[PDB]
Design a binder for these strands. Structure first.
Lengths: 57, 478, 202, 145, 151, 75, 74, 209, 60, 72, 144, 60
RNA sequence: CUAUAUUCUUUG
C-alpha cells in the first residue's frame, strides 16, 4: 500500500477527500428499487410473482 | 430609383420549421385530400400517402445504410419518386444531389461520383433521353445499366464471397447501394433480399426518425442542383436547406393565390432545377393544392400533343414552366379547340437572370392563344430558386418577391460595403429566407459570406435599373 | 448414423474419384442447406437497443460530429467550432419549445411564448401526460408574429425595415475567413493596436 | 455460406421481419414507387395451427403451445401482466381485413367505407388478420369487432 | 525503478476512472478478465463497467492471475454480509470456493481429470480439422489458433 | 511558470486600449431599484440617473459604461 | 443613421471608388498605368473573383481594433 | 488479407445475422474498445448523463422564496407564528395586468414587499428588525480570515434592535448545531454560509419584518 | 483525445464505415507469430486490388 | 529520417512522417505518396512527400484552370 | 361510447374492489362477470399496432383530448450537452463541487460539469434532502 | 502598488473561479520541441487548460 | 528563449 497518494487516500486528503468513488450502497443495476410486478391484470393475484430470485442466493 | 437596393413587403409570414414538420401538419389537417397526381405512373396520392411513405422510404434508406451526414446521387427522369426521395433525405438529413440526365456519359457520371462521393446512387436500367436523328429530336432508350458497369467494372467479376466484401470498388469506396428505379409490371414482387422494407412499424419503443429530427436544424442543406451558368468557375451545384425549399414553395404558393385542391400543373424535366424540385411540390404541400404531372417528357412533338390532351382531361386551373418548353405547346396548341383550354386560367414561366427579359408581346401571344386570364413571369438567379422579382402580363412593373433584398455594392467591404448609384456595375448581394449561400463543389459543402446585416454574397456582378430591374454580368476582367 | 468423414460426400467428388481424376458428372451443385432461427429465443425488445441501433454520431464527447458533417467546410476551424455550437444550441432551444408547447397542449411556436414556459414552470405533476392540440388549432406558422397577429404597441423606430415585427434575419452568420490563432504558433494571436506587431523591430 | 446467410425463421408468428430488419445484402436494390401500396405481411406458414385440436397427446399442439408461451415470455406478458397462463383452448381472434395500407374513403361519396361482412370461416386469406403471438396488424383493419 | 501497485483495495467497488493495477513489463502478471481492459503499451488495468474487483488465479499455474470486475455491487454486498453474519453464528460452510485454502480441492472434486485434459496434445488433424466441415455446415466455426488451454 | 507556455502574446484575459470590458449591471438590481423607489419608471433611465440615485457607486463606473444582464429575472 | 445616410455610397462613384468620401478621380477605371498594371497582376494573382478590381494588401496587422466577429448569433 | 464482413450492413433493433461472419480480417469495435491507448475517459465525457439544473438563486437583489426552506422553518418549535408562505410572495401576473391594484402591494418580478406586520396580534415580539436603506434584510456572510481566502464563513446580523437575546434564542432553534454570540450591536452565527442567510431572511420575512 | 472542453477542437473524424483497418500480422520479429513464414509465393503480379485480394480467399 | 506528407489537394495541410528503412534507403528516386484523412476537407486524400521546413502553400501549389465536363 | 364509460374503460383491472364514475347498473353487471371468472385465463394471444389517423378522429369526433407521446429524455441530455460553451466544462475552481481539492496533475479532473459553490451546503445536515433538489428534479452537488 | 503581479504570470496563467476558490490555470508545454512520432493522445494532452500545482499557486 | 513552420499538423 506504499506510495504518497495511497497515504492520501487513507487519510482522505485533497484529491481523494471523498474516497472510494464507488462504495457499497450504490448499485448501478437496480437503482435500489425492488423489481417486482404488481401490475398484474387481475388485482386478485397481485403478489403472484414474488421472490423470483435475483441471483443464485 | 436613385440608389440600387430593392425590397419586398415583409408582411407575409415565414415558415422556419423542418420539412417533416409541415408534412405531418398537413397530414393531420387534410388526410384524405389529394396531393399529387401522375397518370403515367398510376400515382394518385393524398397527404396521408406523402407522409406515410415519405418516412417509410426514410426508414428504407436507414436500413440501406444511409446516415445523417452523407450524400445521395440521383439520375432519375421526372418521376414521382425523386420528390419522395427529397422528403426522405430531408428526414434523415442526407444531402440529395439531383443531376440532369439529358447529356449523361460514363465520364461525367464518374465525375459526379468523384465530386459528391455519394453513399447511394439512384439510377435506372433504361432511361429515355432526347437525341437528334436527321435534324429532328427523337427519344432514345439509353442503357444506363451499361454505364454503371463501365464506371465500376468490378461488379462484373464475381467470386462467391463478394456480396459481403467491405468495399465494392476500390475506386469509389464510398459507394454502397445502387437503387434501381424501374417499373416492372409483373404481379409478384422481387425477393426480400434485393428489396428494401418500406412498410409497417419499424420499431417497438419509439419511431427513431422523430428521435433524429431533434438533432436536425432547418438550415441543414438538403438538395443540390446543377447551375447551367455558374457564377464563378468554383460554384458547381447550388445547395438548399429545409428553410430555403419550404419558403420558396410557400412564397410562390401565396403570391399567385392557391386554394385547397385547386389544380396546378408542371411541365416535365424541371425536376433538376428549382421549379420541379423546389417550387412546385412544396407549393402544393404548403398550401393545400394538387400538383399534376403531364406526360413524362417534353422535347418531342408527339408527347407535346399527348401532353395537352392530358392537361385538358386533368382540369388544371394553372400551370408552371419555362419558355423553352412553352414553345412546344405553342406550336401544337393551334391544332385544338379554343374551349379545350377553358379550365386553364393563368400560366407561369420562370426565368434565369442570364436569359434576359422575356418579351411581353410573347406573353400576349400566350394569353390570347390559350385563352389565359394571366401570365406570370418570375425571375432571379439560381440561388434564389428562380424568384427575386416577378411581373404579370397586365402589370409590366417588376415587384419584388416578399422578404427579398437585392443590393449592388462596391468592392472594398464585406458587411459595410456601400450601395451603388443605381446604374452602376457592382457586386450583387441577396437577402431572403429562400436565398441560399451554400454551394457544393469537388471539395465538399461550401458557403460564401453571410454577414452581420444579414445579407449574403452571391459572388455575382450586377446592374440595377431605375425601375426595379436587375441585370447579371460576369466578373469584370479589366 | 456416422460416416468416416462425418458428412455425406457430394456425388461430384465420388464419381470423380471412382473414374480417376475425371468430373464430367454432376457439376450442378445443389444450394446449401438453411439455418432457421428461433424468433422466440431472441431476448425481449429493449429501449436502449432502439436508441443506439442507428449508431448516430452525437454521443461523442469530442463535439457534435453530426453537426460537423452537415456544415460547410469553407470555414476556418476555430470559428467553425463555435458555429456548430450555435446550431447545436438552436436545436436545443427548438427542442425545449416543442417540449413546453406539447406540455400546455398549445400548437408549437418558436422563439417560444413566455406564458407557456413560466406557467408550466409552476407545476411539478404536469410532466405526466401531454395532449395534442385539436386539428383545427394546427397551423403552418411557427413564428409568433405570424401567429399572435398584431397587438397594440411598438417601441423601436418606425423608419427602419430591420426592426419590423415580421422581418426575417438569418439565424447565424457564416464567414469563409480563417482563424488568427493557434497554440502551437509562437507569435500568433491578436494584438492591442499600439502593441508591437509581429516580427517588429527586426 | 453459414457465416453469410439472410435470416430465416421457421415461424413468423411474431412477424419478426418487420421489427428485426436486416439490410438487403444485394448491391443493387430495386425500389419502385409502386410498392408503397404493397403490404409486407409474412409468407403463409405450413401446417396452419388455428385448426389444431388441443389434445394433450398431440405433437403439433404441444410444440405450438410451447412456442406461444416462449413468445409470451419474450414480450413480457406472461410472467408480468398474466402470471399464470394455463393454455388449454386454442384461440383464434380474427379481424375482417382487406389488407388496406392506410385508412381509405369512398370515391362516390366521401363517406367512411361501410363496415365489412363479419367473417364466417377461417381461410388462408384470413390468417395474418388474426391475433397470434405478438404479430402486427395495420390499425386500418382493426377498426371493427 | 518505480513501484507499481494496486490503486484500489482488492475486493472493493471501483469506478472506470481509476487505474486498478499498474504492472511492469517482463505475458503479464495480471491479465484483463471480465469487464477489465489493458493498455497495450503500459499494461495498466482499467475497469470498464463500475463494479467490484476480485482476483482470479489460474488453475494451472497460481502465479498467473486475472483481475475481474463484477458489474452489480449489491449482490456481492448482501452476499458477503450474510456470509459474515453466519460466520459469527458458526452457520457458514468453509467448503465454498472463496476460501483460498480449499479452492484446489474444490476444483479437484468437480472435474477430477482436468490435469490430463490440459496435458493432452491434439494431433495436427484434430487441431486443423478439414475445412469442408465448416463449409458444409457440420461445425459452425473454424479456429486453428487456439491450441492452448487457459483455465 | 517556465514549464507553462505563453499563450496569445498579449496574454489570456488581457486589456488593450479599446478592449470592451463592461461592468455588469444585473436586471435584478435595476428592477429592485424601481420597486424599492430609488428610480422613476416614468422617466427614461440613463446611466446618469443610476448614478444620482446611488444604485451604482463611482468605483463601478469605467469606460465603456455598463452591460445589462438578466439574472434570475424571468419577466 | 446607417440605414439612411451611411450605407449609400456617393451618387457619383462606381465600384472601385465606392468607399471614398467623394470620387477621387472622374472615371472609375484604374487611373495610372502603374496602378492598372498592378490591378491586372492582382486579378490573375487571386484567380478571377468578382471584387478584385480593388487592391487589397497582402499582409495584415492582426490588431484587435480592425477585427470583426468570427461567428455567432445574428 | 481479404477485407470483408456483414458488419458493413446495417442491422436494426436486433442482430439476427450469423455472428461468426461479422468482421472478417477487420478489427471490431470490441477490439479497439479493449485496445485503446489512452485511459479512463473522464466522467464529463458521458453525454447521455442527466445533469441537474440549479433553481433560481436567492440574491440580495432578488428574493426568490422556496416553499420547502420555509417548510424547514415550519417544522420547528418556534414561538411567534409565521405568516403562511403564500403571503410573502407578491400578487400574480395576469391579476396585476391593469391599473386596479394598490400602490403598496404592487407586483414585482424580483419579488419585494413592504413588511407584512405580525402574523398574530394580541402578542408582542421581543425584538424588532430594521431593514436596510435599500430594503435588504440584515444578515451578511463574511469569511473568517479572508486574507488567506479561507472557505470557513460566518453570519453577522446587525440591525436587530430590541431584546437581542430572545432573538438569539429563536436563532438557537433554527441553527441548533452552530455557535452563536451576542454583542450590543450585532449577533454572530458561525459556520453558516449563504444558505443560512436564506433561512434567516425567510424567517424574518415570514415573521412580519 | 480532444474533448469539447479543450483549447483546440478538430473536425469530424473519418467515418468508421469506409477505408477499414486491416488486421495485419505484427511485423515486429518479437511480436510476430512463431510459425509465420515469410510470404514468398512466386506469382504473376495482379495490379487491381479487387482480384488481388481474392487470392487471400478460399471460397471454393 | 523525417519528412512531411502534404496533401496533394492543396489545403496546405501536412503530417509528419518518419520513413521506413526501405524508404530511408535511396534505392528509389520517387517521392512516397500515401492515402490519408485530410481534416480540412473532411475527406480521404492523397499525400505527397516534401521537405518539412518550408512554406506549405507555395505559388507553385497552383493548379492550372480546368474546365469541368459537367453543366453547360 | 360515452365519456364516463371511457374513463372506466381506460383504468380497468379485472377484480376491482370498488368502481366509480359509471352508472350503478353497469357496475353490478361487471361485479357479476368478475365473480364468475377465475384469476387465470385459459388462452392468450396478442397482437401489436401502430398509430394512424383513425385515432385522431376517435378523440376529435367525441370532443376528447388526444394524448401525445412525450419527447425523449436522452435526446434532451445530448442536446443540452452539445449546446453549452466549451468553457462550461472546463475547471472553474480549486475545488470539485464535492469539496475535494483538485490538484492539476490528473487529467480526469480537468473538466467540471457543475459549477462549484463554496458558500452553499452548510445547512444540509440540519435539513431534509428535499432541499437539495434542482429545478429538473435531480439533486445538485453540495460541498460536504 | 502593483509591483509584484509581474507579467510573466499574466502571459502564462489566467485566474479562474468563484470567490474563495480560485485556480490559476495554464496549458502544458511538451510541445514545440518534438511533436512527431510520439502519439496523438499524449500530443493533445497539451491542449487543455489545467490548474497549476497548489504549492506554486500559493507561492505566486 | 529566439528563429523557421500560419487551418486541426510541424523544426531545431
Amino acid at each position: 500500500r506504499t506510495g504518497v497518494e495511497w497515504y492520501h487516500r487513507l487519510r482522505r486528503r485533497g484529491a481523494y477527500r471523498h474516497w472510494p468513488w464507488a462504495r457499497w450502497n450504490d448499485d448501478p443495476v437496480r437503482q435500489h428499487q425492488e423489481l417486482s410486478c404488481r401490475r398484474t391484470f387481475s388485482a386478485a393475484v397481485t403478489g403472484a410473482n414474488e421472490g423470483v430470485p435475483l441471483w443464485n442466493y | 430609383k436613385d440608389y440600387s437596393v430593392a425590397s419586398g413587403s415583409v408582411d407575409t409570414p415565414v415558415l422556419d420549421q423542418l420539412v417533416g414538420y409541415y408534412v405531418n401538419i398537413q397530414s393531420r389537417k387534410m388526410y384524405y385530400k389529394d396531393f399529387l397526381r401522375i397518370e403515367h405512373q398510376a400515382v394518385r396520392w393524398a397527404f396521408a400517402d406523402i407522409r406515410k411513405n415519405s418516412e417509410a422510404l426514410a426508414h428504407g434508406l436507414l436500413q440501406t445504410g444511409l446516415r445523417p451526414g452523407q450524400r445521395v446521387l440521383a439520375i432519375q427522369p421526372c418521376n414521382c419518386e425523386t420528390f419522395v426521395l427529397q422528403l426522405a433525405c430531408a428526414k434523415i438529413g442526407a444531402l440529395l444531389a439531383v443531376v440532369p440526365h439529358h447529356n449523361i456519359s460514363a465520364d461525367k457520371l464518374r465525375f459526379y461520383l468523384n465530386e459528391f462521393q455519394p453513399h447511394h446512387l439512384i439510377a435506372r436500367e433504361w432511361i429515355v433521353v432526347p437525341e437528334v436523328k436527321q435534324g429532328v429530336l427523337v427519344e432514345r432508350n439509353m442503357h444506363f445499366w451499361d454505364m454503371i458497369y463501365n464506371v465500376i467494372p468490378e461488379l462484373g467479376l464475381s467470386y462467391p464471397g463478394q456480396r459481403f466484401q467491405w468495399v465494392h470498388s476500390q475506386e469509389f469506396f464510398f459507394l454502397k447501394k445502387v437503387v434501381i428505379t424501374d417499373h416492372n409490371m409483373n404481379l409478384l414482387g422481387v425477393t426480400p433480399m434485393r428489396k428494401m422494407l418500406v412498410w409497417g412499424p419499424f420499431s417497438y419503443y419509439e419511431q427513431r426518425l422523430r428521435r433524429l429530427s431533434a438533432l436536425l436544424h432547418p438550415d441543414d442543406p438538403i438538395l443540390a442542383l446543377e447551375d447551367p451558368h455558374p457564377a464563378l468557375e468554383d460554384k458547381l451545384h447550388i445547395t438548399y436547406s429545409h428553410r430555403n425549399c419550404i419558403n420558396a414553395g410557400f412564397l410562390f404558393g401565396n403570391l399567385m393565390g392557391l386554394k385547397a385542391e385547386s389544380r396546378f400543373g408542371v411541365m416535365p424535366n424541371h425536376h433538376v432545377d428549382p421549379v420541379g424540385a423546389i417550387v412546385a411540390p412544396y407549393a402544393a404541400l404548403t398550401t393545400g393544392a394538387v400538383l399534376v404531372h403531364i406526360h413524362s417528357d417534353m422535347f418531342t412533338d408527339d408527347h407535346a400533343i399527348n401532353g395537352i390532351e392530358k392537361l385538358c382531361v386533368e382540369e388544371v386551373v394553372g400551370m408552371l414552366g419555362k419558355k423553352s418548353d412553352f414553345d412546344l405547346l405553342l406550336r401544337h396548341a393551334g391544332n385544338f379547340d379554343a374551349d379545350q383550354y377553358e379550365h386553364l386560367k393563368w400560366v407561369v414561366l420562370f426565368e434565369d437572370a442570364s436569359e434576359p427579359t422575356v418579351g411581353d408581346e410573347y406573353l400576349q401571344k400566350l394569353a390570347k392563344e390559350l385563352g389565359l386570364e394571366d401570365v406570370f413571369v418570375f425571375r432571379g438567379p439560381l440561388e434564389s430558386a428562380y424568384m427575386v422579382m416577378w411581373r404579370s402580363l397586365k402589370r409590366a412593373r417588376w415587384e419584388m418577391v416578399p422578404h427579398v433584398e437585392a443590393k449592388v455594392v462596391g468592392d472594398r467591404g464585406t458587411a459595410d460595403a456601400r450601395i451603388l448609384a443605381a446604374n452602376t456595375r457592382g457586386n450583387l448581394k441577396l437577402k431572403g429566407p429562400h436565398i441560399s449561400a451554400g454551394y457544393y463543389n469537388n471539395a465538399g459543402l461550401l458557403t460564401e459570406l453571410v454577414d452581420e446585416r444579414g445579407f449574403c454574397s452571391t459572388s455575382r456582378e450586377a446592374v440595377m435599373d431605375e425601375r426595379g430591374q436587375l441585370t447579371l454580368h460576369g466578373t469584370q476582367l479589366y | 448414423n456416422r460416416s468416416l468423414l462425418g458428412y455425406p460426400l457430394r456425388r461430384a467428388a465420388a464419381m470423380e474419384m471412382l473414374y480417376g481424376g475425371i468430373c464430367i458428372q454432376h457439376l450442378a451443385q445443389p444450394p446449401f442447406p438453411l439455418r432457421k432461427i428461433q424468433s422466440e429465443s431472441l431476448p425481449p425488445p429493449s429501449l436502449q437497443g432502439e436508441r443506439d441501433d442507428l449508431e448516430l454520431e452525437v454521443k461523442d464527447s469530442t463535439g457534435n460530429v453530426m453537426g460537423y458533417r452537415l456544415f460547410p467546410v469553407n470555414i476556418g476551424i476555430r470559428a467553425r467550432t463555435e458555429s456548430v455550437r450555435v446550431r447545436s444550441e438552436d436545436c436545443y432551444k427548438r427542442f425545449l419549445a416543442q417540449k413546453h408547447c406539447a406540455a400546455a397542449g398549445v400548437p408549437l411556436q418558436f422563439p417560444a411564448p413566455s406564458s407557456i414556459t413560466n406557467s408550466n414552470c409552476l407545476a411539478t405533476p404536469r410532466a405526466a401526460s401531454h395532449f395534442h392540440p385539436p386539428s383545427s388549432s394546427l397551423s403552418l406558422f411557427t413564428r409568433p408574429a405570424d401567429s399572435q397577429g398584431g397587438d397594440v404597441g411598438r417601441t423601436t423606430p418606425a423608419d427602419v425595415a430591420a426592426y419590423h415585427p415580421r422581418a426575417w434575419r438569418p439565424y447565424q452568420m457564416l464567414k469563409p475567413m480563417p482563424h488568427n490563432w493557434g497554440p502551437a504558433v509562437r507569435s500568433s494571436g491578436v494584438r492591442g493596436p499600439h502593441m508591437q506587431l509581429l516580427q517588429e523591430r527586426i | 455460406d453459414t457465416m453469410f446467410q439472410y435470416p430465416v425463421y421457421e415461424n413468423e408468428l411474431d412477424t419478426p421481419h418487420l421489427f428485426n430488419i436486416t439490410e438487403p445484402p444485394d448491391f443493387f436494390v430495386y425500389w419502385n414507387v409502386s410498392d408503397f401500396e404493397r403490404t409486407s405481411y409474412p409468407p403463409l406458414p405450413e401446417e396452419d395451427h388455428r385448426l389444431l385440436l388441443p389434445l394433450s397427446g398431440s405433437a403439433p399442439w404441444k410444440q405450438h403451445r410451447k412456442r406461444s408461451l416462449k413468445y409470451l415470455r419474450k414480450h413480457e406478458i406472461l410472467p408480468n401482466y398474466l402470471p399464470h397462463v394455463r393454455q388449454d383452448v386454442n384461440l383464434s381472434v380474427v379481424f375482417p381485413g382487406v389488407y388496406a395500407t392506410r385508412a381509405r374513403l369512398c370515391e362516390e361519396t366521401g363517406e367512411p367505407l361501410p363496415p365489412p361482412p363479419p367473417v364466417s370461416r377461417m381461410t388462408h386469406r384470413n390468417f395474418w388478420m388474426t391475433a397470434h403471438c405478438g404479430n402486427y396488424i395495420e390499425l386500418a383493419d382493426l377498426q371493427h369487432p | 525503478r518505480k513501484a507499481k501497485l494496486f490503486h484500489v483495495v482488492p475486493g472493493t467497488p471501483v469506478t472506470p476512472f481509476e487505474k486498478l493495477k499498474e504492472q511492469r513489463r517482463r505475458l503479464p502478471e495480471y491479465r484483463p478478465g471480465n469487464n477489465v481492459r489493458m493498455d497495450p503499451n503500459t499494461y495498466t488495468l482499467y475497469a470498464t463497467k463500475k463494479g467490484v474487483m476480485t482476483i482470479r488465479e489460474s488453475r494451472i499455474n497460481p502465479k498467473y492471475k486475472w483481475l475481474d470486475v463484477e458489474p452489480d455491487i449489491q449482490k456481492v454486498y448482501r452476499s458477503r454480509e450474510l456470509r459474515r453474519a453466519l460466520q459469527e453464528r458458526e452457520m457458514a460452510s468453509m467448503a465454498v470456493g472463496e476460501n483460498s485454502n480449499y479452492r484446489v480441492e474444490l476444483d479437484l472434486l468437480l472435474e477430477p481429470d482436468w490435469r490430463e485434459r490440459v496435458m493432452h496434445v491434439p494431433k495436427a488433424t484434430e487441431r486443423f480439422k478439414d475445412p469442408n466441415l465448416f463449409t458444409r455446415g457440420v461445425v459452425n466455426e473454424l479456429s486453428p489458433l487456439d491450441r492452448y488451454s487457459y483455465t | 511558470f517556465m514549464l507553462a507556455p505563453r499563450v496569445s502574446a498579449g496574454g489570456p484575459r488581457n486589456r488593450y486600449e479599446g478592449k470592451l470590458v463592461f461592468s455588469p449591471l444585473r436586471l435584478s438590481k435595476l428592477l429592485w431599484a424601481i420597486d424599492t423607489g430609488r428610480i422613476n419608471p416614468n422617466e427614461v433611465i440613463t446611466l446618469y440617473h443610476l448614478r444620482q440615485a446611488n444604485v451604482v457607486g463611482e468605483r463601478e463606473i469605467v469606460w465603456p459604461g455598463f452591460v445589462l444582464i438578466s439574472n434570475g429575472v424571468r419577466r | 443613421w446607417y440605414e439612411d445616410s451611411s450605407k449609400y455610397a456617393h451618387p457619383a462613384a462606381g465600384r472601385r471608388y465606392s468607399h471614398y468620401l467623394k470620387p477621387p478621380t472622374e472615371r472609375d477605371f484604374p487611373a495610372t498605368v502603374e496602378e492598372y498594371e498592378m490591378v491586372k497582376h492582382h486579378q490573375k494573382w487571386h484567380l478571377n473573383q468578382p471584387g478584385t478590381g480593388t487592391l487589397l494588401p497582402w499582409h495584415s496587422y492582426n490588431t484587435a481594433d480592425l477585427v470583426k466577429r468570427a461567428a455567432g448569433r445574428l | 488479407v481479404w477485407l470483408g464482413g456483414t458488419a458493413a450492413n446495417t442491422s436494426l433493433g436486433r442482430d439476427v445475422m450469423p455472428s461468426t461472419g461479422k468482421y472478417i480480417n477487420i478489427v471490431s469495435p470490441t477490439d479497439v474498445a479493449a485496445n485503446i491507448s489512452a485511459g479512463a475517459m473522464p466522467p464529463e465525457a458521458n453525454v447521455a448523463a442527466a445533469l441537474p439544473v440549479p433553481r433560481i438563486q436567492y440574491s440580495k437583489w432578488n428574493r426568490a422564496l422556496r416553499s420547502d426552506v420555509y417548510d424547514e422553518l415550519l417544522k420547528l418549535p418556534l414561538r411567534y407564528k409565521l405568516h403562511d408562505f403564500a403571503k410573502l410572495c407578491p400578487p400574480q401576473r395576469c391579476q396585476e395586468e391593469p391599473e386596479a391594484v394598490g400602490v403598496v402591494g404592487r407586483d414585482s418580478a424580483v419579488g419585494y414587499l413592504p413588511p407584512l406586520g405580525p402574523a398574530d396580534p394580541l402578542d408582542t415580539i421581543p425584538f424588532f428588525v430594521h431593514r436596510s436603506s435599500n430594503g435588504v434584510l440584515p444578515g451578511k456572510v463574511f469569511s473568517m480570515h479572508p486574507r488567506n481566502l479561507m472557505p470557513a464563513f460566518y453570519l453577522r446580523i446587525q440591525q436587530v434592535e430590541g431584546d437581542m437575546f430572545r432573538f438569539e434564542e429563536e436563532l438557537l432553534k433554527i441553527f441548533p448545531t452552530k455557535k452563536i454570540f451576542v454583542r450590543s450591536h450585532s449577533i454572530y452565527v458561525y459556520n453558516v454560509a449563504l444558505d443560512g442567510r436564506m433561512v434567516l431572511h425567510h424567517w424574518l420575512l415570514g415573521l412580519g419584518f | 483525445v480532444l474533448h469539447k472542453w479543450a483549447v483546440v477542437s478538430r473536425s469530424a473524424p473519418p467515418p468508421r464505415g469506409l477505408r477499414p483497418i486491416a488486421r495485419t500480422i505484427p511485423t515486429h520479429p518479437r511480436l510476430r507469430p512463431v510459425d509465420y513464414k515469410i510470404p514468398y509465393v512466386l506469382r504473376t503480379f495482379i495490379k487491381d486490388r479487387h482480384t488481388s485480394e481474392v487470392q487471400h480467399l478460399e471460397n471454393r | 529520417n523525417m519528412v512531411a506528407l502534404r496533401s496533394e489537394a492543396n489545403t496546405g495541410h501536412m503530417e509528419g512522417y518518419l520513413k521506413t528503412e526501405t524508404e530511408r534507403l535511396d534505392a528509389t528516386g520517387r517521392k512516397v505518396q500515401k492515402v490519408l484523412w485530410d481534416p480540412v476537407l473532411q475527406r480521404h486524400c492523397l499525400f505527397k512527400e516534401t521537405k518539412i521546413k518550408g512554406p506549405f502553400m507555395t505559388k507553385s501549389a497552383i493548379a492550372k484552370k480546368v474546365d469541368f465536363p459537367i453543366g453547360g | 361510447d360515452s365519456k364516463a364509460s371511457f374513463a372506466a374503460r381506460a383504468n380497468f383491472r379485472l377484480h376491482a374492489q370498488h368502481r366509480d364514475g359509471i352508472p350503478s347498473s353497469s357496475v353490478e353487471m361487471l361485479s357479476r362477470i368478475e365473480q364468475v371468472l377465475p384469476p387465470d385465463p385459459s388462452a392468450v394471444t396478442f397482437f401489436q399496432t401502430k398509430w394512424d389517423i383513425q385515432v385522431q378522429e376517435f378523440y376529435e369526433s367525441r370532443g376528447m383530448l388526444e394524448p401525445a407521446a412525450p419527447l425523449d429524455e436522452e435526446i434532451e441530455a445530448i442536446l443540452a450537452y452539445h449546446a453549452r460553451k466549451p468553457s462550461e466544462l472546463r475547471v472553474r475552481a480549486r475545488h470539485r463541487p464535492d469539496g475535494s481539492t483538485n490538484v492539476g496533475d490528473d487529467p480526469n479532473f480537468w473538466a467540471q460539469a457543475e459549477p462549484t459553490r463554496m458558500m452553499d451546503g452548510s445547512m444540509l445536515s440540519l435539513w431534509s434532502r428535499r432541499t437539495t433538489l434542482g429545478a429538473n428534479g435531480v439533486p445538485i452537488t453540495y460541498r460536504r | 502598488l502593483a509591483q509584484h503581479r509581474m507579467q510573466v504570470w499574466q502571459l502564462r496563467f489566467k485566474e479562474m473561479g468563484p470567490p474563495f476558490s480560485r485556480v490559476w490555470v495554464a496549458l502544458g508545454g511538451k510541445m514545440r520541441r518534438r511533436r512527431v512520432g510520439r502519439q496523438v493522445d499524449v500530443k493533445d494532452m497539451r491542449y487543455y487548460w489545467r490548474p497549476i500545482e497548489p504549492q506554486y499557486q500559493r507561492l505566486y
